[PDB]
Amino acid sequence: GTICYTGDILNPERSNIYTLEYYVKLAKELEREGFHILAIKDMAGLLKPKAAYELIGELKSAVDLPIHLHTHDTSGNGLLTYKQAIDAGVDIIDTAVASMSGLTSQPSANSLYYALNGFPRHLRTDIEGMESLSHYWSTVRTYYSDFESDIKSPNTEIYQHEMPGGQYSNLSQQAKSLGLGERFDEVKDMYR
Amino acid sequence: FPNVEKRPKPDYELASIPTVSSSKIASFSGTKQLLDEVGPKGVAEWVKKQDDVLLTDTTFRDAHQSLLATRVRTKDMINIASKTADVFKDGFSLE
Amino acid sequence: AEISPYYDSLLVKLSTHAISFKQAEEKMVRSLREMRIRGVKTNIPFLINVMKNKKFTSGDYTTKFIEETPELFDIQPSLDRGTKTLEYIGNVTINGFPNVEKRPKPDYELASIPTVSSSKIASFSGTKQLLDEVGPKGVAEWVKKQDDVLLTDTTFRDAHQSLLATRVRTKDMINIASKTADVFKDGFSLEMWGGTTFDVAYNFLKENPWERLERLRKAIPNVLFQMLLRASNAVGYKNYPDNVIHKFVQESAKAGIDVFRIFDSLNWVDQMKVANEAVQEAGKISEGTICYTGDILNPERSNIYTLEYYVKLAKELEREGFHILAIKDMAGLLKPKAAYELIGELKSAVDLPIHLHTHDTSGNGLLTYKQAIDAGVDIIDTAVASMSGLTSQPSANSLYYALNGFPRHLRTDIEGMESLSHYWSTVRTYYSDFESDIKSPNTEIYQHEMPGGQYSNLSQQAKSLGLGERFDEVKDMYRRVNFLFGDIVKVTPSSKVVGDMALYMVQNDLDEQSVITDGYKLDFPESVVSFFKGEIGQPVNGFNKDLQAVILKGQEALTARPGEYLEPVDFEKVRELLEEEQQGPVTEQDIISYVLYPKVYEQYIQTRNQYGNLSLLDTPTFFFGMRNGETVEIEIDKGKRLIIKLETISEPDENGNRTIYYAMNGQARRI
Amino acid sequence: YIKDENVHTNANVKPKADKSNPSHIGAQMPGSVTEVKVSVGETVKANQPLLITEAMKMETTIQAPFDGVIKQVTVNNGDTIATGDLLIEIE
Amino acid sequence: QIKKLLVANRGEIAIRIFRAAAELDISTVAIYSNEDKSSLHRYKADESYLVGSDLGPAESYLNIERIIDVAKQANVDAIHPGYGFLSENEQFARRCAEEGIKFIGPHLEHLDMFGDKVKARTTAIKADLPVIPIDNPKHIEVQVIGDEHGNIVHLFERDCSVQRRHQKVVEVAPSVGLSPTLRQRICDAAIQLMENIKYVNAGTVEFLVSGDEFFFIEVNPRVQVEHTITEMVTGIDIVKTQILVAAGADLFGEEINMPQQKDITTLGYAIQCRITTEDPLNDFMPDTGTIIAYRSSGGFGVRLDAGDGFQG
Ligand SMILES: *C(=O)CCCC[C@@H]1SC[C@@H]2NC(=O)N[C@@H]21
Ligand SMILES: [Mn+2]
Numbered sequence A: 001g002t003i004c005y006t007g008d009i010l011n012p013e014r015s016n017i018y019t020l021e022y023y024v025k026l027a028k029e030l031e032r033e034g035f036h037i038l039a040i041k042d043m044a045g046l047l048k049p050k051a052a053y054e055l056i057g058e059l060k061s062a063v064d065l066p067i068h069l070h071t072h073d074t075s076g077n078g079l080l081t082y083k084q085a086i087d088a089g090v091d092i093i094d095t096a097v098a099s100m101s102g103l104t105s106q107p108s109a110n111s112l113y114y115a116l117n118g119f120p121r122h123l124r125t126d127i128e129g130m131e132s133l134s135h136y137w138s139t140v141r142t143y144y145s146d147f148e149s150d151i152k153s154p155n156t157e158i159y160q161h162e163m164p165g166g167q168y169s170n171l172s173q174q175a176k177s178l179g180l181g182e183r184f185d186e187v188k189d190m191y192r
Numbered sequence B: 001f002p003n004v005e006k007r008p009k010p011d012y013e014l015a016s017i018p019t020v021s022s023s024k025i026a027s028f029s030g031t032k033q034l035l036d037e038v039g040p041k042g043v044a045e046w047v048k049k050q051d052d053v054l055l056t057d058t059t060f061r062d063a064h065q066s067l068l069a070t071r072v073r074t075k076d077m078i079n080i081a082s083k084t085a086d087v088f089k090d091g092f093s094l095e
Numbered sequence C: 001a002e003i004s005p006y007y008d009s010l011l012v013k014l015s016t017h018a019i020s021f022k023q024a025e026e027k028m029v030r031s032l033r034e035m036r037i038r039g040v041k042t043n044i045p046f047l048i049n050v051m052k053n054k055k056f057t058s059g060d061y062t063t064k065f066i067e068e069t070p071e072l073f074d075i076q077p078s079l080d081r082g083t084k085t086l087e088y089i090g091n092v093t094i095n096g097f098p099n100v101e102k103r104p105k106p107d108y109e110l111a112s113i114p115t116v117s118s119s120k121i122a123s124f125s126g127t128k129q130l131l132d133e134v135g136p137k138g139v140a141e142w143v144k145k146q147d148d149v150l151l152t153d154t155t156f157r158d159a160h161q162s163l164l165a166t167r168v169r170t171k172d173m174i175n176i177a178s179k180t181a182d183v184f185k186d187g188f189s190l191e192m193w194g195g196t197t198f199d200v201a202y203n204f205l206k207e208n209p210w211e212r213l214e215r216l217r218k219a220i221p222n223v224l225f226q227m228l229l230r231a232s233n234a235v236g237y238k239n240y241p242d243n244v245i246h247k248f249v250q251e252s253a254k255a256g257i258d259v260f261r262i263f264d265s266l267n268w269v270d271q272m273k274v275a276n277e278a279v280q281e282a283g284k285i286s287e288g289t290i291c292y293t294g295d296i297l298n299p300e301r302s303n304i305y306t307l308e309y310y311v312k313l314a315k316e317l318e319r320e321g322f323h324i325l326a327i328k329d330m331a332g333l334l335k336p337k338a339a340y341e342l343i344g345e346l347k348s349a350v351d352l353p354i355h356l357h358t359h360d361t362s363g364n365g366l367l368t369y370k371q372a373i374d375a376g377v378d379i380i381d382t383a384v385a386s387m388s389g390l391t392s393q394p395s396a397n398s399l400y401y402a403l404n405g406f407p408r409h410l411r412t413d414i415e416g417m418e419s420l421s422h423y424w425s426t427v428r429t430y431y432s433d434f435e436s437d438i439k440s441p442n443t444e445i446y447q448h449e450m451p452g453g454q455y456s457n458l459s460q461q462a463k464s465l466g467l468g469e470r471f472d473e474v475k476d477m478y479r480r481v482n483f484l485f486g487d488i489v490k491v492t493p494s495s496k497v498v499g500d501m502a503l504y505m506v507q508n509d510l511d512e513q514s515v516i517t518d519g520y521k522l523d524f525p526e527s528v529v530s531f532f533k534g535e536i537g538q539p540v541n542g543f544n545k546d547l548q549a550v551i552l553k554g555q556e557a558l559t560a561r562p563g564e565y566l567e568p569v570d571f572e573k574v575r576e577l578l579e580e581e582q583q584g585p586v587t588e589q590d591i592i593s594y595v596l597y598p599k600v601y602e603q604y605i606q607t608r609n610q611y612g613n614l615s616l617l618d619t620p621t622f623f624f625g626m627r628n629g630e631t632v633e634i635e636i637d638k639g640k641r642l643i644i645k646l647e648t649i650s651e652p653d654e655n656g657n658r659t660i661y662y663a664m665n666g667q668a669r670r671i
Numbered sequence D: 001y002i003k004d005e006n007v008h009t010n011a012n013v014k015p016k017a018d019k020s021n022p023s024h025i026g027a028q029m030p031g032s033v034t035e036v037k038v039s040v041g042e043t044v045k046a047n048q049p050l051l052i053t054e055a056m057k058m059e060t061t062i063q064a065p066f067d068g069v070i071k072q073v074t075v076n077n078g079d080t081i082a083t084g085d086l087l088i089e090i091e
Numbered sequence E: 001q002i003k004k005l006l007v008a009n010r011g012e013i014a015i016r017i018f019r020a021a022a023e024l025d026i027s028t029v030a031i032y033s034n035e036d037k038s039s040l041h042r043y044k045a046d047e048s049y050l051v052g053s054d055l056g057p058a059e060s061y062l063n064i065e066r067i068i069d070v071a072k073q074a075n076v077d078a079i080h081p082g083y084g085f086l087s088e089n090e091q092f093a094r095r096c097a098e099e100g101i102k103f104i105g106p107h108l109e110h111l112d113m114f115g116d117k118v119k120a121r122t123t124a125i126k127a128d129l130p131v132i133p134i135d136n137p138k139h140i141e142v143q144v145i146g147d148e149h150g151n152i153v154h155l156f157e158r159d160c161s162v163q164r165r166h167q168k169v170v171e172v173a174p175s176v177g178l179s180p181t182l183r184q185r186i187c188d189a190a191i192q193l194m195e196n197i198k199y200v201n202a203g204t205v206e207f208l209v210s211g212d213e214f215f216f217i218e219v220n221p222r223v224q225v226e227h228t229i230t231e232m233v234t235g236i237d238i239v240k241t242q243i244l245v246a247a248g249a250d251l252f253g254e255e256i257n258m259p260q261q262k263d264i265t266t267l268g269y270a271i272q273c274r275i276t277t278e279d280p281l282n283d284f285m286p287d288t289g290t291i292i293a294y295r296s297s298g299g300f301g302v303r304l305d306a307g308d309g310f311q312g
C-alpha cells in the first residue's frame, strides 16, 4: 500500500492538508485494507532528510507494517534522506547501482553502504559485488547514450514546483516547442 | 535507427560480463524461498525482525526509466542476471 | 592600394577651411585623427603634432620651425588591436582550437545574466570590510561566534578545476561578479585563485590570471577572496627559494587575495613556515591545512593516521600561529561519521575555527557536511548546484534545504543560489569539450585513495600505454605503492609520484619484493627518484632505507627542506631580461609570474603580442571563432565595443592563404 | 547576386534565428524538411502546424506559438536544417 | 564648460555633431535602436549605447525618459537634439535641465511659443509681421543665431522654393533674382521678431514672398537639414556655434570668431541636394536592401555631410 509523498510536513505554512496526521490516517487506513507492507513513494524527491526522520518515526508508531521507502535523488539529498529514515527505523529502501544512480534516479547503494559506517544500522548487501555490477552497467550505459537525460546537476527548485521524475526537463522541451523557452520561469511558476 | 544519432557502429569498451554458475544459484535461499515457506503475511513479519536495512534494487526498472528513457533492453539485464542473483542474494526484492 | 617606390608617394591631400585660423587648425587635427591607414607606416602622427604645436596656432613661424622643435618627434606605434582580434577569430574559424572538436560553432542558449548595480554593492559591508576593521585575528574570533554555518564558494576555482579542466574563462566569471557579490554577501570567502588556475590561465586560456584577480576584486569588494597556496612552491611546478614564495604572497595580497589556505602534500609542518610567515607579514588570513587520508573509523586501516595524529597536528598548526584550521579532504575520504568524530574532537583540541573542504566523488559529501555541522564546523566549501557534485564540492543549494529541521542553518541566499546555478548551467555548456568522463559516484576511492582528478587522468594514461585493459591491477598497485611508500598523504605532487609507480610497476611487471631485487638496473620514473630524494618534502613515516637506496642509485637525498638548498632569485636580473624582451617597463606581477613559469609566461607574451587581449572575447567565440553571417560584439568599456561581422571565407589561394571578408565597426576589412 | 539553378539543393545556408525575438522560430534539432504547410502572408491560429521536419527517422510538427501572419518561410521541402536556423517569422 | 556631449539623433546630423564636438575637444556619445544596430553614426562617436532594448526601432529615438537614463549613466552634461525628433519637443528640454543636462537649443518658452500653429503667429503680430491673404510664392527663410549674452545675428536667407508637395527638394543660398533691398527687408524682419523675444541658439524664420512683400509663416527652432548651404557662403559653422552657445560664450568672442553684423557677407552661391532612396518609378517611395556599390565624389566646392549610404 503506497503513499505518494507531496508537500513539506516540516513547513506548517506549506499545506493545511498534507499534514503528518494526514499520512498517519492514510497509513492506518491502508493497514486495515490488509496490505502486507506500507510504502512511501517520493516521486518528486520531496522528502527532506528531517522530514523522513519525522514521517517514518511516526508511521512506525502508527502501523505495525514494515515501511518500504522509495525516493529519487533529484534534489541531491536522497542519501541523507535515506540515512535519516534508517535512523528512524525504516525497514526497506529503494537503491540503485552506483553507475545507474543519482539525480532523477535512486540514491546510490554503493555510497549508502559506506555512508552508514560508524552508525548503528548497516545495509545488508555485497559491496564488492555491487562495485562489480556498477562497473558492468557503466559500460552498458554507453550503448544508451542517445537516450540520456538532460539533467546533469541536482535541482532544488523542485521544492517549489514539485514536478516529478523528468517532467521539469520534458515540460521544458514542451515549452520550447510552444515558443516559451525564454519564459520557462513563468511556466515553473504557473505549474505551482 | 529512430532517435539514434547516425554514426558508424562505435568501438566500445568490452564488458567482460561477470557470471555465477547456475548450480551455485540453485543452492541459494533468499526471499523468494521465504515467500514459498511462510507466505506474504510471514515475509512481512520477517522484515519486522530484521535489524539491518534491507534494500530493493531498481536498476532493472526505475533507475533506467529515469536515466535512459526506459530503453534498457532484456539482453543487457539477462547478461548479468546470474551475477545480480549472487550480489543481491540477501536483498529484499528486485524491481 | 599597392604602393610603389617609383613615384612621389601621396596618399591624401587634406585641406581645411574656416572663418578663423584657430578653427581651421582644429578641423585639420580632427580630420587627421579620423584618418586611419593600416599596413604601412604613414606620416599622420607627425602632421598631427605639427598642427597641435602651440607655436603654430599663434602664427608668426619661421622656416626653422621644424629644426627648433624637439617635442615634434615622438615614439608612438599606435598598436592596431582590432586587426589582431580579426586575425585570432580568423585563425580559430579556419584551423580550430586545442582539444576542441573541430565542428561548426555550436548553438547555445541565451544566458540571462542577472545584475546588481555597483552603487548597491558599494553599500555592502561583508567579510572583506571586517578584515579591514578587526584584522586576521578579529575575523577568526568573529567566525567562532557565529551560530550559522558560513560558506565558501568554489565555483570560480575548484569546482571547474574538478569538472571542466580549469578551463572556465575570466569573461564568464566577470559577467556574474556583481550578482555573485550580492548572492554571497554573507559568505565567508570566495575561492577564486590558486590551484591549477595560475598555470592554466597563462598557458591554455592565454589570459593573465592577475587581471582575473584584479577585475574580480573591483566587482566584488565585500567578500574575502581566498586562494589555495601550496607550501613548497605556492602556485608553481617545482621548488623555489624563500624570497620567491615571499614575493608571490606580497603581490597576491596587494592584488586582493585575503585568505591563503596553506597546505603541504605530506602534512609536513616544517615546509609550511615560510608561506605562513609571508602571509602574516602581508596582514592577511593564514589557513593551516591538514590533508586527510586513511579512515579514522577503521583502526585496521592505519597505525599512523589515527584520530590523535590529527589532533596533535591541529595543536601544532595552532602553535604555528595559523588563524584558521582547514581540513582538506582531497580524495573525498572523510566518511560522515568520521567527519562528526574528527571535527568534534578538533573543536575540543584547538581554539581555532575549523574550515572544512571535501569532494563529493563518493557521493557522500553533503552527509559529511551535515555531520560536520552537527559537530560544530565553522566554515565549509560549497559549489553552485550546476557546478557541484562528483569530483567537485557538495551542492550549496542542496545543503541549504538539507538542514531544514536541524539546529544549524546555512547562512546564504537560495533565490540567489538558484539564479547563479541557472547562469552556470548555461555557461558550462560552452565548455563541453572539457567535461570529465566521470558521471556517477565511485566508492572505490575508499580503497585506492586517488585524489581529485587522478582516477580519470590515470585512466587515459593507463590506456596511452598498454594497460588500458588491466586497469584493475593499476587500481590495486596504486594502493600497494602507497603502502610500499610507507602510507603517505596523496595530493599534488605526491599523488603523481604514487600514480607514476603504479603504471611503471604494472608495465615492467614489478612485485613489491622484486622492486629491490631488480632495482639496481630498473631506472625508475623521475617523480619517484625525486620523492626519495626529499625534493617534495618528508613523509610522515619517512623512507624505507633499502627502497630509497635502490631508487636513488648513489644520489644523495636532502636532509632539510628543499627550499633551503636553493639560491635566492635575483629579481633584478629577471627585470633586466623581461625589459629587453618586451617594449620596456615591466611590473612586479610580470617578474614573479616569469619566475614561477618561465616558458609558459614567455609563450603568453608571444600570444599577447600576436592577438592582443583575448580575455575580452566571449567563450563561444574564443573556442570556435565565427560562422558566416554572424555578428559578434566585444565589450571593452561602457559603450566601447568592437562590432565584428563575418561575411565569407574565400577558397585557399596558391599559398594556401584564405581571404576573410570582415566588417568591423562598419568598415569593410580583409584578413 | 546570381541564383544557383538546382545544383546544391540543400546546401543553402539559412540565417540564424534571433532567440530573443519571439517572432523567430528556430530549429530545435538538425534534420530535413518534410512538409511546408504555410506560405508568406497567410493568417494562422495558435498551435496550427506550419512545418513538418524529420530528424532521426522521426517527424516533428512545428506549430504557430500564437495567432499571427507568416512574414517569411525560410525553407522548402527536402531542405536540410541545423539547430538554431531561422525557419518561420510571425506577428 | 562642457566635458561630454550626447546626440539624441541618428544619421548624417549626428555625425555632423560628433565632428563639431570633437573639434571643441569634447567627448561624444551616441544612441541607437534595434534596426540601427549598424547605422554609421553609432561608430563615429566615442561612446555608443543601446536605447530601449524592448521598445520598437521607430519609437526608440522618441523616448524622453530612456535617453536621459543613458545620459545620466555616462556623465553627459549636454545633449544635442539635432532635427526632426525631439528637437521641437518642450518636455525634453525641461527634463534635460531638471537632470542638470544642458539642452542645446532655445529655452523652454521658445519651443512652447513656436510649437503651436496659433501661438507661432500671435508672437508675430506682437512683433509687427503679416499673415492673412499667396499667388506665385517664393519660399525664403532666414538663418538666425543668438547667444545667452543678448547678441543675435542673421546669416542671410535660403531660397527653399524648389519643392514638391509636403517636401523640400532643392535649396539655394543666397536667393537669386530678388533685389538687394528686398532680401534686406526679409532679413531685417527676421531679426525684428527674434531680437524681440530674446531668442537663444540657432533658429529659422520662414517667410513667403509674393511680388515685393514679406509674410511670416512659421519658426523652426533648431538646425534644419539645409543648414550646410548657408555655412559655405557665410563661412560660419552653425552646428559648432550651437555647442559654443551652450557653454555661455559671447558671439563676437575669441571662441566663435563670429564677424559683426555688417562684417557677415555671402561669398558666391550654394546649392543643396538630399540623396534619399526615392524615385519616380515608385513615385518617391523608399526601398529595402543592401547597398552593393557606393560611389562618392568630393573635390572643390562639393561638400559632403554624409550618413547612411556605404559599403553595403
Ligand atoms: C590554432 O593554431 C589556432 C590559433 C589558436 C590559438 C589559441 S590562443 C589560446 C589557446 N592556447 C593556445 O596555445 N592556442 C589556443
Ligand atoms: Mn519512482
Ligand SMILES: [Mn+2]
Residues within 6 Å of the ligand: C158, C329, C330, C357, C358, C359, C452
Ligand atoms: Mn580540493
